[PDB]
Amino acid sequence: WKLLSKAQEKFGKNKSR
């Protein structure tokens, strides 16, 4: 989803669990 890939791509630190 270009919407999630563009709204989540900027979250490379939130996915450190």
What CA–CA distance (Å, rounded) separates 8 from 15? 9
Cα-to-chain-centroid distance, residue 8: 2
Q: How were these coordinates obtained? A: NMR
User: Residue 14 to residues 2, 3, 8, 9: CA-CA distances in angstroms?
Assistant: 19, 17, 9, 10
Please give the DSSP secondary-structure letter assigned to residue 15: -
What CA–CA distance (Å, rounded) separates 3 from 17? 22
Q: Which two tokens stand for residue 7?
A: 């709204």
Q: How many CA atoms lie within 13 A of 8 on its CB side?
A: 6
Please give the DSSP secondary-structure letter assigned to residue 8: S
Question: Which residues, at least 6 apart from 16, have a Cβ–Cβ distance to it below 8 Å?
Answer: none
Q: What are the φ and ψ backbone dihedral angles of 16, each rounded to 5 degrees?
A: -120, 35
Rounded to a whole number of angstroms, the distance between the first and last alpha carbons of the chain is 22
Q: What are the φ and ψ backbone dihedral angles of 7, each rounded to 5 degrees?
A: -100, -15
The amino acid occupying position 1 is W
